Amino acid sequence: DGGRVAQARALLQQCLHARLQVRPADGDAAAQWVEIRRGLVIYVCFFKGADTDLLPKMVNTLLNVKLSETETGKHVSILDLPGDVLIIPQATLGGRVKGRSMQYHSNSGKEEGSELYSQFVSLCEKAVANNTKSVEAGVAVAHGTYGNRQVLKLDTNGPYTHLIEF
Amino acid sequence: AQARALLQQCLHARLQVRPADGDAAAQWVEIRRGLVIYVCFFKGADTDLLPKMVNTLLNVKLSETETGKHVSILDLPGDVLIIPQATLGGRVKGRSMQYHSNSGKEEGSELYSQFVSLCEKAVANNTKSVEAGVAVAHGTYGNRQVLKLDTNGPYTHLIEF
C-alpha cells in the first residue's frame, strides 16, 4: 500500500440502549438528549487529505458489516438486524501517543471535519431510509453534536467492539 | 504488531464476570471514576513487553481534571477496568471480519492474566492511587462482556503496540 495514509477511523459497538447528550445545560435550560434502543454505535474520526469517495464507502462498509447478533446467535448487519444507529463524533480516535501526551496532527481541521461529519450523518440517514427492513421496523438514526462533550451512557449485552480504517 | 488497546474514560462501569446459571444470578464487578481498557493480543506477542505496555496505558494523560487539563489515571487518581476484547483485532473482509492475527485461547488467556496482574501491581505501587483506595477490576477472558457504561465523554483513544 506504499504508506498510503489513512483517511478515517470508525469504532463500532453494539448496544441494547444508548443515551447521548446533544446540548449541554445552559443556565435555566436543562441539557438535551437523544437515545436509541438496540443498535449500533459508530464513533467517527476523519483525517486530512481524503478522497471524494470516502463517505459513501464508509456508509456502505459500516452499515453492511455483519456485527449484530440475531436471536440465533448468527451475525448480521445493522440494516438486517434491523436496529438503530447512533453516530458519535470522536476525533480523539486519531490521536497518536507522544511521551505521555497525544498528538492529533493527522486529524481534519474543525471546518473540514464538521462538514464531513454532517455529510456522513446525512448519507447514513438516507441509507437507512432506503432499506426496507429498517423502514418497516421503524428504526432510527441519531447523532452527536459536532464540537460538544459526548456525554454518553451505554447499556450493552457485550459491545463486541471493532475498529475499521479507511 | 503485539497488541491493541482502546481507552475510554468513565464515571461508572459495571461488567458481568459470570453469567447467570439457573438460580445463581449473574456476578459482576464495578468501578467508579476511572479508565476502561479494552485489550487485544496478537499471535507471538512478547510477554517481556507487557510491563512497558501497562506503563504506557496507566501513565498516558487522558483523564480530565476540574481545570480541564489532562493527567494519567495514576495521577487523577481513578479506577481501572480491564475488558478482554480480541474483536478489536478484527479486520474487515467484505461483509465479515477476519481475526487471523489474534492470539489463540491458550496464549491469549495467559497474556491477559499477566497484563491484569501487572496493572494491579502498578496501581498498588502508586502512592496517590493507594491513598485514595482506587481499584483495578477485570473481565473474565472469553465470556460475553456484558457492560453498562456511564461517561462524561468517553474521550476514546486507541494505542497500538
Residue numbers in the entry:
A (entry chain A): 3 to 168
B (entry chain B): 8 to 168
What does the paper behind this entry write?
Here, we describe the identification and characterization of a unique DTD-like factor, named Animalia-specific tRNA deacylase (ATD). Present in kingdom Animalia and more specifically all across phylum Chordata, ATD proofreads a critical tRNA selection error made by AlaRS. An unprecedented switch from the chiral-selective “Gly-cisPro” dipeptide in DTD to “Gly-transPro” in ATD is the key to ATD’s gaining of L-chiral selectivity. This “gain of function” through relaxation of substrate chiral specificity underlies ATD’s unique capability of correcting the error in tRNA selection.
To gain insights into ATD’s function, we solved the crystal structure of MmATD at 1.86 Å resolution. We were able to solve the structure by molecular replacement using PfDTD as the search model, despite the fact that the two share < 30% sequence identity. Structural superposition of MmATD on PfDTD and NTD from Pyrococcus abyssi (PabNTD) showed an r.m.s.d. of 1.68 Å over 141 Cα atoms and 3.34 Å over 77 Cα atoms, respectively. As is the case with DTD and NTD, ATD too is a homodimeric protein. The crystal structure of ATD revealed that its characteristic motifs (–PQATL– and –TNGPYTH–) are present at the dimeric interface like the corresponding active site motifs of DTD (–SQFTL– and –NXGPVT–). Surprisingly, MmATD’s Gly-Pro motif occurs in trans conformation, unlike DTD’s Gly-Pro motif which always exists in cis conformation as observed in 107 protomers of 19 crystal structures from 5 different organisms. In contrast, the interaction of MmATD’s Arg151 side chain with the main chain of Gly-transPro motif from the dimeric counterpart pulls the motif’s backbone outwards, thus holding the motif rigidly in trans conformation. Comparative analysis of active sites of DTD and ATD further revealed that the inward flip of ATD’s carbonyl oxygens due to trans conformation of its Gly-Pro motif has created “additional” space in its active site when compared to DTD. Strikingly, when tested with L-Ala-tRNAAla, 500 nM MmATD displayed noticeable activity. Strikingly, biochemical assays with MmATD showed significantly higher selectivity for the non-cognate l-Ala-tRNAThr(G4•U69) as the enzyme acts on the substrate at just 1 nM compared to its activity on the cognate l-Thr-tRNAThr(G4•U69) at 50 nM.
